[PDB]
Symmetry: none
Subunit: 449 residues, 4 copies
DNA sequence: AGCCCGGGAAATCTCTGCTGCAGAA
DNA sequence: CTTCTGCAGCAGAGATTTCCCGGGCT
């Protein structure tokens, strides 16, 4: 009669997104989807339809009893707990830390000075040892025998009008063991150093959703399922890792960007549009004269900074000759009347073919010029490479990107704002006023201006 | 008609400012004031009234004829000229260092690799020694006979029209020799080492007027009048350098900030006003409460960037207790949407009576937390110390200053615009709704939000 | 050969920081003495029959051992200073950092000894061992005798005084850097040349300490030098084949908080460095400028202690305090073209019982551009908040409290004006504005 | 009748200058002032009217007979002849190095392989130990009697349309030993090893002039002379060292002002260098695999920082898969033992041909990620472009440039002293390890280990 | 006689200015 | 048939490069 419940639980979906807050309490029920206004942990792990003991989440790491598949016995999984009691991290080198953005995690063993035996005597560290031996071997079946590592970090909600600490967890994703190294920590109370296992783990990609649902955690606990039969509900990252090996880790590692990135198509105007044709006329006109293109880049950048609702003044153009990383410069004032701060804005302009794209080093050449409190801006006829936007966003470089469609729209504004001599004599206005004064002056001299 | 042209030119306001455009041309009359839109150099030095030969600015280190008074024959003055090769400065040997704000100018002797022997056979070095012995003299009489050093640097600018490369120079002011020492320089062209003379100079100040009377040279090249009557048109800084010794140099040093210094009374609201009483009630209310003040400052700083119409996003509170280097966080998107780049704003507040000023050390603690493209903001009911302000301006700290006046004005504006009721409603709303941090994350994560 | 196989049957390991019972009395057979492990039993096992190697103050080692291929030198044993109990007051002493696996030791050379440094048998074998560890072949490196460090201990045992005839295991180390210094002993009272040795403590890998079987196996004559390493630490084994290239990465790392309490930053009361600190406090209480110059020289000595290249730029100003008190520069590179590192510094003389606020050092931190480092010198200690703010927010600034300052000053004085502190103090107060210039920190590059 | 000549010597200044070409002959006389147009060495060292014995000078360390001053027996001077003896064919890695631009010189002892016992068993080494003993020293009295070391280097000169390398010598100035270390040297051609002492020293400055007054030399070389009255014509720098001690060592360093920009030819090894072919093989070998060259460059930079005797630790590699922004990471501990601070080094390595330079964009891509107090290092076979280095100097980029001769130098010196001549095992090691040292840790995580 | 971190004009020098021709997408 | 895109020791101001002067001294 229990087979019906097992099947019922087996078929129904149980989804959880990475970074979500899960409810963790003593006792309670595993048959409840929601508890105290939050998603139940035990229900997500072991719904109870299988009639199996719950998966406990306690100090250090925790692993269920050995699950005997028809083929052979297998370790179900490993639930890992990290305790930042009240955002204690990271004042000290014990330093259990998660970077869920780039998909890297560093955790440490539960070994303590009170323990007499060598590291690995504790249940947790020994399970970490077995997992380490299983994550590194010759055969390809032992990796199927290797239990997955589920990351959980303590979190205080301060929600629903009631501030509470503990009793809540956070799923940081599934992890694989990249490294295991014996390190020596220090107990301040007794002033005594102790050996312990240090684990470097990598979080894999969760797919398009970035959140995973686990019907396969029951598969790992299923007594009637073979080791290679449990990968049915597994994410594509993990199974493709099983296929390829540890060489696929950089490709399967989870990647979260703070801001969205734009494809080449979206930045540019439509192909059949006359805006793109106008952009190509800009390409033809400013190919010979890069200096005009620079002056226009200054005008456009100005229009953008003023479109943001911020105060901007264009200082000048760095050089008309001698190349270098700076083409021109302006100033952004941050704040309101009688309350502001000066910001030096280094304007850069590069004219290139639409097919080719700007390389990250060319942008980083402008980024390197930037001192503290400065903002760069890059204006190009084409688009930006993926690695460029990656280096800008992930490393948090403050650069304003001006693509083809943006400058095209800006031009569309300016040409009807001032239509003297039609569209073309604005470009002529770029060449005629291209001299636009000059300066050997450092960027810091723009403040006094 | 000896004194006919002299007596009228003897009382003229020959005050000159640093940064103006001066004309140095061959075949320039001493009678005409301005040449082709700008003032003439030869006219400025000796405008025909004296009958003296026009001082020619040549050969780097330059000086007029020796002057013999009744006693102690002296050198009238010294005309120092630093010129771009071009690209002699900052791209070549020589490249005399120039720092205007700190009044420090490093200059090189007239010794050349083509000139053999110890520095120096050229008149430049000998004049440099003859002057330096008087400038470094511990005797006031020596400081009386000490030849003034008038510095000049050719700058390209003009008004409208076209840029200038020759015939145009800029008055850099007068300077006093800080140090004199020998150096070794190497020529890239020949690869041969040669000795030279190097010296550190201290540029003086003209005061609030910041003007330098060029009538000084008249009594400086007068053989009849000596020392006592030669300082009549000299700047007070120079006469103070004459009366006292080299120990008063840092006190008489020229220090000009790019921005403007705000007085304590200037930062505070007008005396007797309603906003003043409002601020007094603010300090009265928030003297005991800190977190509520921090939140209030977060709200004030929230729309102070948004007042211009600029794109802003209000962040979170770091911690309920234990504080942080900066109390609250904000974000500033720059440019059109999807082209917007995040700018991290780190704010901190402190409650103190308007009669008190903010120490530079804590502001430094704020700006020490800054990174690439990060800006700070400090909010207080009091004013800021002058040292703090000048340290921020001179070293270009990127931070917004919120004094008691701006705070009171912005707060009253907030109350009337969004409430209009008694401030008590706002205060209470703040204390109940926040002052308690729901989210405690790293500041770099504000970009993801 | 039953006994040797018997002691080969049972493992022998000792962790770093293990207290050992040191007694000329007692025997080789027994495993423990007076509640502590026996040293002579540790170094000399009962299943061998070899004599007991004695551990005396300073460097000590058994004579060379004849091998089938070539003669092999027995390991090096080092005994630490009393630190101090009134026995040694010398500024140049043994500095132990077991957290980063870095240990600086100073050899034994005395004014009574006439000649050149390294003439004594211990120092002869020491320099020869230095030759072996700096060997160009793998054979020469495996021929190199291990260096085992030991320290004296001042503690408490079972509610009683401690300790009489007890030491502490500091681990095994590899000869990395050598130096030639000239020190001066006040009680000697003549000055004498002395050797300096920078050692890198190895990591035991999976184990904290090392296997004691290694030494007992290497001491044996039949053991071949290539095959004499079996239980040797993986770090040492890797180093033998890799050479000097392995040294930077194989050092033992102990994860611990870098925050030192106010008491830890202050020298011992009986150290006699503290008295110097107090004299400096009363002296520079009125004159801060001489303290700024003194701090510049002290920092200059600190950076040159690691063998780096420091060049003193100048002092910022002689009138009033500010963000920076003094400026220096550290050049590192191909030397055909050297990459300069700007050094900004501030010094404040306060009471040793007073703590330095984080804002005051943040005033210096805020002046740091990319590739620049800060220096803060104070007679007192640093506050906890300051330390944790510097560590957590990753501030590139060295901190000099009362202890480090007094120690460095003592070193400098003894090095030059040894016998007279007033001469060094005179050297600090004579020139005020001689080193003082008004320049931008980025102008130190030209110098 | 040698008294009058001595008085003659004392009255007229006798000066030598740095960079001067001197004629040295073993069979010359002390009488003739100059030989073949060039001033004589012996005549300058000691005149014929002095009565002083003929001083001998040969390859390596040369020390004249000891002298007894009335106060105490004293060592006058130490002459040092340094010649590569290469004729451009040097393979000796421990050959002496000279950098007079920064005033640092690496000298090496006269210890020989066949020379037995512990170093030094030779004259030069021992008297250099005495010299160093006096150099470090203690109290002023020892500093007074401390014998100066004068450097003479074999140079190629040109005389009357004819040029011969041997027969002349150059004056490199008087220097003081900073530090002395123990090192093991090996003959490149034939495999061997011998102990020797290595000295890092620095040349002082000549004060007003660039060189040394040899009249003071005569004053010190005098048998009967006072203690502090021995030097009246001595350079002020040496007197400053005398009064201060080691405290003035960083301040008295000889400095020559020149452009730090190096050309392609200047960075790369000589035309007859055997390391060139090795570099070609390195290009052909790492042409397919770049990350192996990245690890190679990591260990190279490590050896470079370890060459100064500083504190450095091995880092890790970012990816070893495809391409990426940062090639390798490292850490440097700056300060003493008890007191130090960690700094993060971001290293980049791209394999190009020695004839090709490095564009500024590529290195600026590395500079862009450098935080506050962070440095970087670029290691490559090819040289660096002029614009790149200029860009480094202008913006004060903290980067170490390893290219051409330097790379081959540290690599060869490494092979000779570590892997013992076999480069095959080294290359193979770089091949096997490109996937072993790869961690996904943050650059800030290097502080942990 | 001389020099010198010069300016002036008259000597080349730099690099996009483009028009009608033709011939091609 | 279009309508643009090639061909051409072409035009030509602003910017360098040469060379002639300069002014005021020891």
């Amino acid at each position: 009669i229990a087979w019906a419940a097992s099947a019922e639980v087996a078929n129904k979906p149980r989804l959880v997104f990475v970074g979500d807050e899960l409810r963790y309490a003593q006792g309670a029920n595993q048959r409840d989807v929601e508890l105290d206004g939050f998603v139940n942990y035990h229900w997500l792990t072991s719904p109870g339809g299988l009639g199996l003991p719950k998966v406990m989440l306690e100090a250090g790491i925790n692993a269920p009893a050995e699950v005997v598949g028809p083929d052979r016995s297998r370790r179900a999984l490993i639930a890992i707990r990290s305790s930042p009691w009240k955002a204690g991290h990271e004042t000290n080198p014990w330093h259990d830390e998660f970077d869920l953005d780039h998909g890297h995690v560093r955790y440490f063993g539960d070994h303590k000075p009170s323990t007499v035996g060598l590291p690995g005597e504790t249940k947790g560290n020994r399970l970490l040892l077995e997992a380490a031996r299983l994550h590194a071997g010759t055969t390809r079946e032992e990796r199927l025998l290797a239990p997955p590592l589920f990351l959980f970090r303590a979190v205080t909600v301060h929600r629903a009008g009631r501030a509470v600490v503990k009793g809540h967890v956070e799923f940081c994703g599934a992890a694989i063991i990249e490294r295991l190294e014996h390190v020596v920590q220090r107990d301040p109370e007794t002033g005594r150093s102790f050996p312990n296992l240090s684990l470097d783990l990598a979080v894999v990609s969760g797919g398009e959703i970035d959140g995973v649902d686990f019907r396969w955690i029951d598969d790992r606990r299923n007594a009637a399922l073979a080791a290679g039969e449990t990968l049915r509900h597994a994410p594509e990252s993990w199974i493709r890792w099983v296929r390829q090996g540890r060489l696929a880790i950089p490709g399967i590692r989870r990647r979260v960007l703070a801001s969205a990135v734009q494809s080449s198509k979206e930045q540019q105007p439509a192909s059949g549009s006359a805006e793109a044709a106008t952009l190509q006329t800009l390409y033809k006109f400013y190919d010979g004269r890069k200096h005009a293109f620079e002056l226009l880049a200054s005008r456009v950048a100005a229009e953008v900074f003023r479109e943001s609702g911020a105060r901007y003044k264009e200082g000048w153009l760095s050089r008309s000759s001698g190349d270098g990383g700076v083409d021109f410069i302006g100033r952004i004032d941050m704040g309101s009347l009688k309350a502001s701060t000066p910001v030096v804005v280094l304007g850069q302009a590069k004219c290139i073919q639409p097919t080719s794209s700007v390389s990250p080093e060319q942008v980083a050449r402008v980024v390197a010029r930037l001192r503290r409190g400065w903002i760069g801006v890059y204006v190009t006829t084409g688009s930006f490479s993926r690695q460029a936007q990656v280096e800008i966003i992930d490393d948090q470089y403050p650069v304003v990107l001006i693509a083809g469609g943006t400058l095209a729209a800006t031009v569309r504004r300016m040409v009807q704002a001032n239509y003297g001599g039609d569209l073309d004599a604005l470009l002529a206005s770029t060449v005629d006023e291209y001299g636009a004064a000059v300066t050997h002056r450092r960027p810091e001299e723009v403040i006094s201006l």
